[PDB]
Amino acid sequence: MGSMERASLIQKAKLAEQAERYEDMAAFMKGAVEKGEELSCEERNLLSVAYKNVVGGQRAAWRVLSSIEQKSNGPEVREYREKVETELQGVCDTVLGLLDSHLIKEAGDAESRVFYLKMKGDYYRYLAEVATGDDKKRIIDSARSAYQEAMDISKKEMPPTNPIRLGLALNFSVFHYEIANSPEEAISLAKTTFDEAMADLHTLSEDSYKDSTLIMQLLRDNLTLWT
């Protein structure tokens, strides 16, 4: 995308979202990141939406194929599951590479730095979902380390109702429950996050209240499933 203007890449990413062309959207946003400038709040959201949709389709396909493969146990199911898995890993490596070159190092404000470190935790988490063995251990630790740095910043620099802080806590709790075999840590984090947000809702406008309570309901939904 080197020959396209940054502003045109951003405009086309928004059009691709409306057209539900998420692979295109991700390619446009990768091109925008590679222009080398920092991303605004809205541009960060476009980057995240694009790749979340791409990797989300891959994860859903991998789960279907992994289930069929487990039931079977010719080479075809394993070969095709491996093909999807390699593609998924490639997308995760691409996102992680954008974060490392050079989005995180240039992110100084809490809102940008927390957002990117949460993304780093998420994409290592998606790698962990398909990893097998000792490779799994180092990938799991990379996810944990990114989430933990984001949590430390968010608790120092953001109010407990901030939607990014809430979504980080939600996703770190899912990491604990689904990846790290720590369901008690997942439940404790979700409960403490919910309760501290509740106590801060009185400070918010009607619109901010709506944004925060929407994510709080997701924390509650997980707590209901886990307890």
Binding site: E42, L46, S48, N53, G56, G167, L170, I215, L218
Partner: peptide, 9 residues
């Protein structure tokens, strides 16, 4: 369980 859906801007 459920992470941030995050599939719509």
């Amino acid at each position: 369980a459920g992470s941030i859906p995050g599939r719509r801007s």
